[PDB]
Paper text:
SARS-CoV-2 Mpro is a cysteine protease that forms a dimer composed of two protomers. Each protomer comprises the chymotrypsin and 3C-like peptidase domains I and II (residues 10–99 and 100–182, respectively), with the active site consisting of a Cys145-His41 catalytic dyad located in the cleft between the two antiparallel-β-barrel domains. Mpro cleaves the polyproteins at 11 positions with a consensus cleavage sequence Leu Gln | (Ser, Ala, Gly) to release nsp’s, which are required to assemble the viral replication-transcription complex. In addition to the indispensable role in viral replication, SARS-CoV-2 Mpro also plays an essential role in escaping antiviral defense by cleaving host cell proteins.
Crystal structures of 11 Mpro mutants provided structural insight into their altered functionality. We employed crystallographic structural analysis together with a high fidelity FRET activity assay by our group to assess the functional and structural changes in Mpro mutants. The crystal structures of several variants revealed the changes in side chains orientations of residues in the active site comprising substrate binding pockets, especially S2 and S4, which might lead to altered amino acids preferences. Accordingly, changes in KM values for most of variants were observed, indicating alterations in a mode of substrate binding. We observe the highest level of conformational plasticity around the S2′ and S3′ binding pockets with N142 and S46 being the most flexible residues within the structures we solved. Also, we observed that the charge distribution in the active site changes quite dramatically even upon a single substitution especially around the S3′ and S2 binding pockets. This might explain why with most mutants we see the changes in binding affinities and not the kcat values.
Residue numbers in the entry:
A (entry chain B), B (entry chain A): 1 to 306
The structure:
Amino acid sequence: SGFRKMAFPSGKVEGCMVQVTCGTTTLNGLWLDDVVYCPRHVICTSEDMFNPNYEDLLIRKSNHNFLVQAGNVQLRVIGHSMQNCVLKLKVDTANPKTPKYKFVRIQPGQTFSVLACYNGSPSGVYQCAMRPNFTIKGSFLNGSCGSVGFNIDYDCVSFCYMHHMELPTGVHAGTDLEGNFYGPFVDRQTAQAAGTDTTITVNVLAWLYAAVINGDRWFLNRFTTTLNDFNLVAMKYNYEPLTQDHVDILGPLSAQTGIAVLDMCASLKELLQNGMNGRTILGSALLEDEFTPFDVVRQCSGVTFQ
Amino acid sequence: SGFRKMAFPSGKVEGCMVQVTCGTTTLNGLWLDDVVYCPRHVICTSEDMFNPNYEDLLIRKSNHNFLVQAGNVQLRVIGHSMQNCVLKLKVDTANPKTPKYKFVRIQPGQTFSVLACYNGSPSGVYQCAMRPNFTIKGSFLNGSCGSVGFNIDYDCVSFCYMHHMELPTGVHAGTDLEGNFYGPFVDRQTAQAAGTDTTITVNVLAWLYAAVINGDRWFLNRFTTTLNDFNLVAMKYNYEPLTQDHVDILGPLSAQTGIAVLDMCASLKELLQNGMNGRTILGSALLEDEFTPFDVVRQCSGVTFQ
């Protein structure tokens, strides 16, 4: 029993974290097969980040300038290239610690594990979610660029996030591992407004679904409410609307609790309209939108990777 | 920046995660050098768990009765022994994935990362704290005994936990790696009492300092309160008492922020008497006792002026 925000075992990823130093900048790279992925902004120093023409900045550049190193061993680039907002560079030797892996871009509301790294060495691991305004709530300090976001299925490690920078509203933005930013964001350092954020409803539903799994009944209430009055009180309290698709993703948990996915919405309305009235669901008076239903099953079943 | 319950990279431990099977029972072992550590009650059937004589059960069991496997390849047990409530298995070959490590006992209110395991295969990583009543609130289903607790300091993984059981209120109890349970518990199906639990004061005090690092002071207050009448309203709100030593380890967070531990103490007492009035400190309407001041420094860099 018990329920905790849970990260995947970082082990398959740690082996790919390397330090890249190009000029005055140092950040982290992803050493997969025989190529290192890292944020496009390694070629530019911290002073000229206002508006660099990155395409022009690379035209003069050559392989030899880049010092990519694994722990202590140094590596040389036999080919450099820029795809979107990464700088994928082919190195002399492959990484034999490369796991089975996939590149994926995830849609707002999913969750993943982050492996924070500073100067090529992982420092920490935690669990976040792509916010509906295309941000994340991370812990990233200086020298943390290129720290990755990932999921695991069996042997396979699908990477889904690579860190680029911090917004003036405290949050972070980056790209997918194809180098394409998440959200109305860009790398060039500018005032980008962290859009307004809505609560991910289906993920709050799932966390209530961990709750009755864990043996919490406080919020339970019998009377039910229409599908669309949910969408109605959803927009009222800045909650993302439910679709039938979510009702189907909740299907797997539906039978296991024995509650219809609709009835819990009504108990949710009780939480949202009446407030928590000073009590706790799964050790939180906060409604939690940072858990997807795959997240809840992985913890109540206890699936594994190896 | 930002603040997250963050675990250490579990990679160094995963290489030691191994499966142990005795009879009909399977749980996890800690494969360090050429010995596997695991909870002693794997020699036990569900029948003898009510009252076991472990010495007798272990003589009856032999080298060949123990099956330790790498999720894949089998390993050979050429020696078994019992240290308190663990079970050292001298295995034929050493583990070339052995980290630098320490066997360590931690004090209540300290924190560590747990790597949950099932059939020798990891499932997840998260952050905990040994509670003052000597429990932890984990995520543990069946087949998770022998999941270890660890920290990482530079290279070495100071080990501090091997999980044994679940208490009737949902929480968990286990041992150190010398085999000694934290708390008045032992491995025997009995009426085992989960003691009453108090909140870790020093961690909340520290956790307020992550909040002023965020630079939001809504909780900061003009009102001051004395040091020792606090220890009194502490027992009133079931908090373990603050000590001066606690304040000296907390001092480093004080000096870099410039807040005296006393006024943060006063803001806390005022905070608990009237409540937060529906506002949130670091995205939580619940106070956090699971962050050490070392945790707060490990996550906030800070600097100190003199």
